Design a protein around this nucleic acid. Sequence first.
RNA 1: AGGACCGAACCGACUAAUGUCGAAAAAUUAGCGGAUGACUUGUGGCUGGGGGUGAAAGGCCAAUCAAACCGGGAGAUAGCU
RNA 2: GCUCGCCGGAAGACCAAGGGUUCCUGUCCAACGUUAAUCGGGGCAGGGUGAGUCGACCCCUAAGGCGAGGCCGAAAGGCG
RNA 3: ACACAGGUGGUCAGGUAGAGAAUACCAAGGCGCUUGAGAGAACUCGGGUGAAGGAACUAGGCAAAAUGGUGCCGUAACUUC
RNA 4: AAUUCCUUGUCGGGUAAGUUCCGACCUGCACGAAUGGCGUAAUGAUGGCCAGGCUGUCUCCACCCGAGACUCAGUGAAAU
RNA 5: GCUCAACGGAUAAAAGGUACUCCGGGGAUAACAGGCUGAUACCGCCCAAGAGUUCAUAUCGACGGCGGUGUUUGGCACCUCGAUGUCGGCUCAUCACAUCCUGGGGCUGAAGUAGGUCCCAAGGGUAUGGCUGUUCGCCAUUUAAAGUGGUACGCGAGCUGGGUUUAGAACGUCGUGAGACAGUUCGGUCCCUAUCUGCCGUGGGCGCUGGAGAACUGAGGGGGGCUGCUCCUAGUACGAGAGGACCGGAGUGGACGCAUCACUGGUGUUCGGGUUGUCAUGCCAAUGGCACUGCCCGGUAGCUAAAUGCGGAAGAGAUAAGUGCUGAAAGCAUCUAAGCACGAAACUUGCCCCGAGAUGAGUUCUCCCUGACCCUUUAAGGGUCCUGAAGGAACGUUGAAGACGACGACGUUGAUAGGCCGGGUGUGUAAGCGCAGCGAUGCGUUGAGCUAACCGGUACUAAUGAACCGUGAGGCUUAACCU
Lengths: 56, 122, 53, 120
Amino acid sequence: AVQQNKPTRSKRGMRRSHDALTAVTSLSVDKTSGEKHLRHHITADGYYRGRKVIAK
Amino acid sequence: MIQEQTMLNVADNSGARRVMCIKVLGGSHRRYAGVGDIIKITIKEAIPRGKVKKGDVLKAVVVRTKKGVRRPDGSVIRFDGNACVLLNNNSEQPIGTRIFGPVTRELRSEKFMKIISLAPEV
Amino acid sequence: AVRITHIPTGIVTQCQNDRSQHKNKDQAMKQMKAKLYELEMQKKNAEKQAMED
Amino acid sequence: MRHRKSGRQLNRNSSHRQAMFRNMAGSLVRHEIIKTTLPKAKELRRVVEPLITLAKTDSVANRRLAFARTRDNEIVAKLFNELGPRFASRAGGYTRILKCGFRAGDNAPMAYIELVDRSE
RNA sequence: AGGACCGAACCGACUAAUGUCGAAAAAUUAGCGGAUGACUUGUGGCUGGGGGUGAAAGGCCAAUCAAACCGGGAGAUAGCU
RNA sequence: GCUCGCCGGAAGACCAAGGGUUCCUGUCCAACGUUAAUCGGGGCAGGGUGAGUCGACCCCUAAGGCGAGGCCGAAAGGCG
RNA sequence: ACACAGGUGGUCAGGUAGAGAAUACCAAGGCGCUUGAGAGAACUCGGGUGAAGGAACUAGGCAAAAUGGUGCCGUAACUUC
RNA sequence: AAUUCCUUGUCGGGUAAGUUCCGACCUGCACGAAUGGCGUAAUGAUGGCCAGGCUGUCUCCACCCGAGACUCAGUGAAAU
RNA sequence: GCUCAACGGAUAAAAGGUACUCCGGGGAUAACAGGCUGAUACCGCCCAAGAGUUCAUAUCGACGGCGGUGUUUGGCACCUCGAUGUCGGCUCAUCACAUCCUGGGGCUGAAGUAGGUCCCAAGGGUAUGGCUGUUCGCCAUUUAAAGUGGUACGCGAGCUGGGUUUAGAACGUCGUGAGACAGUUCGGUCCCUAUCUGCCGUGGGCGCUGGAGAACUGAGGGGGGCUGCUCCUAGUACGAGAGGACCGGAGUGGACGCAUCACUGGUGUUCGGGUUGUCAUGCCAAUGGCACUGCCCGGUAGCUAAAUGCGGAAGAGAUAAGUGCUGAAAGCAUCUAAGCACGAAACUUGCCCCGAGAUGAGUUCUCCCUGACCCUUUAAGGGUCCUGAAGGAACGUUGAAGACGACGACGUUGAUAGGCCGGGUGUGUAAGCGCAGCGAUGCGUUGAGCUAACCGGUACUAAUGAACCGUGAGGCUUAACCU
C-alpha cells in the first residue's frame, strides 16, 4: 500500500545505481563524406556505405 | 464423457427411457464414465407396464456416448446418442432382453457377454 | 449451544434455553431425561390400552 | 506465447491494420521512396512484394485482383505499366530498407523504404 | 374512450460489472419502468429554520439535515485529553 | 494536397439564457495547453457589431409585489 | 475549481430499406476525441468461439446464453366475463 | 402463518437425498373481525418454490481479438 | 414540627426511551482474538468386585484416586477503545500424532475368512451432492479412507456479503407511551498504484590474487513417496458343511504430477467461401468499406485439453514396535549388560531437478600475452609514448528464446530474416468468354482460381571492412627439486 518509514537518501543512491545511461561508442565513419554516422544508419546528408542513397 | 446430472436414453426393453446418472463407480473422485463402465443411475421416465418405475435407483452400464471411443489404431467411433443398458444393481446382470441400436466391441468382458449377443450390430 | 442425542432412542435436544454451556448441558440432560420420562408413559399407555381390550 | 507466430499487431485492430497498410502501399509506388517507422517498414515488405509479384505478369484477372487489393486505379496504372516491366528480370526482393535517424518527437526509430530500381 | 398494451424522444433509476487519490465531491456500459397522464418541462412568482414543505423517510430547504448558513453573545462551559 | 475512418433526429446548422472580445488579421513562444508547437479560446498591437419592418424599450394585463388615505400592531412593521 | 466521458430550453432535420424522429449505411455539414513509438508475459477490464454433460457452482439460474418480426390456423384452468 | 419458542412439529406430494415450498391435523408459547377477518380474476423492475428450454455459471478451463500492464522518448502526482 | 427515598441530609418540590445519534475520555471497564489458570471438557495411568458359559487381566468396568495437553465453556482484566474492523463459503495451504486408510507386529473365546484391541510410524493420500446463513448436523450415492486438532475458532492491504450488529417496513408478545425482544420477516456502498521483511522468477557489479573459452566432480537443497481390481500360484493350506488364505508372480484401471501435438477435437478477428442491408468505382458485372469478424460455414502453423506417452521403484546400509541364538548377573531359566543376525510407505541413499558466492570460491582440457625513459613510499607502484592480443561487447538480421535483461543461430568464408520458385495444406469449379433458358441460373473451359505462420532450394533485399573494451609473463615465505 504505502511506505512505513522514510528510506534514506543513501538507499535512493543505490536504487539509481543501475539507472546510469550508457554511451554508444559505435560511431562509424562514412567513406566518401567521412561524416560520423551510426553503425547501419545513413549519414546526415544521406550517404551510406559510399553511396548517395537518400537522393536529397 | 458421461457424468452425474446427465440424461441418457436406455437401449433395452426394461421399461425406462429417460434416465439420469447420479454417480460414476470405479475408483474415488472419478469424473467420467467411458463407454465401457458402470454407473449408478435413477429413472425419470418409464413406460406404464414396465419392469421398473419412475424414481428407482439401480446400476447401469453405458454402451453409447456422443464422445465416442478411440481404438488402438487411432480411429474413433462416435455416436449421436448417450445410450445405456440397465443392470440389476446387486447381481449386475441386464434386466432387459432386447437391446436397441448398435453397440461397440469394447463390451468384450464377461459381465456383458449376454449384452453383445442381443445387440443388432457390432 | 449444546445438542445431546439419545442414540438408542434417537431423541435429540438442542438446549438453547440458558446462556452458559454447562447450564444448557444439564438442562439438556434435564430435557432428554424429560423426553424419556414421557415416552415411557406412552408405551405404558400402550400397556394400559390392551388391558382394556 | 507467440511461438512461431508471424506478423505484427502494431497497436491496431486488424480492420484498421489492413486498411492502414493498404493506403501505405499505394503511397510507396507513387513516390518510389518514403520515410516511416522501422517496424512498419519491416512489415510493409510483406504487403507490396506480392503485388509486385502479381505485377510481374499481366492478366485481366490479375489487374482486377490488383484492384481488389489496394483499391486504386491510378496506382494500378503505376503497376503493370512501369513496375511490372521494369521488374521483369528482378526475382524477389524489390524493396530496400535504410534506417534513418530517430523521429524528433517520440524518438521513434525512423527508416527509409525504397524500391531497388529507382534509376535516379 | 381508456390513470389501456408494445415502444423511441423525455422523465425515472430495478440488476450486474467498472470506478473508489475515478472521466465524475453518484457517473459510464449493457439490459430495464412509465411514456394521453396522479405525465413531463421552460419562464416568472409565494412559503423559511423549531419554521417552511412533505403520495410521510423524518425526506428536502444552494453538494452541508433529528435540525441550513452568516455574524454576534463568546476567549460560552469543560471534574476530561 | 491525395487516400482512410467516425457522427449523421448527431459529434450538423440557427435563436433564447448566460458569459463578456473568447470573433478577424499581423506578430511573438518564457508562462498556460497534462508532450513538442513554426498551432491555439495563450502574450502584444490594430480592426470588427450599421435596422421604421428582427428583439427589447413602449401600449395592455396574469400569478404576484408595492401601495395615497384607511385598518391593525410596544416600536420596527403587517394586511389591503 | 480544470481545455472535466455529466447537465442545458426552443427551431429546421434529406436518400435507400424500414411501421418509425428505432436501427443500419450515406448527404448537407462537422470531425479523428491533444501525448506517442514498439513488445504482444502473468494478471485486470471490454468481447468472440468452444468438443461431452447442461445448474452438478451458488445464499439464489446473479451474469450470460436464448427467445424475438409479419400473416394464417389454434389457444386451458380461472374470472368481476 | 410475514404470527409456532421447544420444532427441521407430526403425517401425504415433490427428490436418489428437501431445516425452504405445496396440501392436512390442532397442542393457537403469543390469530381473530374496520388495531378489520377470510377469499379474489387481473396487475407488479416484488417474497419463496419446482419443470421445460438454453447456455462456460460449473466439472476444467482452452485459444483468440482489442485497451492497459512491460520497454523507449516527453511532462510529471498522492495517501504515508 | 411536615423534614431529609440513598439516614454528613446536591433546597424538606422530581420518572423513562434513543440502533441518526452527537461531543469529550477509557483497554482505568465489557464482546472477537492473544495471555496466566486448568474448575469444566479431552486424553492417559492405579486399586479392583462384578458382567461376561466356566475364568475380571479376552474386553468393559462400578467404588475412589493420581497426572498431562491447552482444541469446549468458563475464571481474572495483563495488551489494543487518537480501531486488533467481521461468522460461514471460495482459493491456497502448512504443522503436530492421540492414525481414517495403505505398511510392519503382539494377543485372542484369532478354526478358515472376516473383525475386535494394543504398540511402532507423518511417507503419501485423506469424496460428490440434497437441505440450512452455516460450522455442526441429517439423508443419498460412493470410496482403499471420506481422520482428530493447531495455525488471530489459518486465510477478506486475495474474493463474496448469504448471516449479522446502521438508516425503511410489517407480524406476534410486553409496555399508558416512546420503544424494547429467549424473537422472525422482505431490502440493504466491502477503500488502498506495495517503501521494507518474506516468497516465486530473472538480471547487472564485483570477487575467485594472470586473462579468456567450454566440459564436469560435488557439499548442500528441492521435487518425488497413494492405491484399487482381476487372474495365476491353488478353488491348494485350513474347514464337519458353508466358505475361503499369508508369501510370491503377471496384467489392467482410478486419482495426481511431468512432457509432447503423430492421432480425436477446441481455438484459429493475418486463409478460402456463401450471404442480408447499404455507400462508392458513370452504369451492369466484378470487387472493396461498414454494421460485435455484420451474421455464419470450414480451416494451416502455433497454443491447448477432454487427446497421447511416462513416473511412483526394485534394491542396499543403519533402526522402531517386534523376533531369535549363545549366555550372564542369580549353578537353573533369560533377546542382554559383552557379542551377533533379521526387522516398515518411516531414517540415509537409490530416481529426477538446481547446484563451486560451497569467500572451503574446487577439478580437467585448450588458447593468448615475455616494449621503452623518468618519478621514486625504491613501491605487488605511477606518468607518457610504441603496442592493445585470446576473447568479449556493441551494432545489425532474428528464434518453437523472451516482460525488460539474459540465453541461442548467423553476419556474405552466408541461408538469420523477408521475398521469389516449387511442393504441401485449406477453401470448393475464380474472373472472362461461349451455349441453353422468358428469368433466377445451369453447363464446358476447371479440383481450377486464390492460398497466413509448414518443408526444400535461390543471396533478389537487408545483416559493411574496422572501430570500442580487455594487455605487454602474474607478490612474499617454506619445503622439495636444478648449477
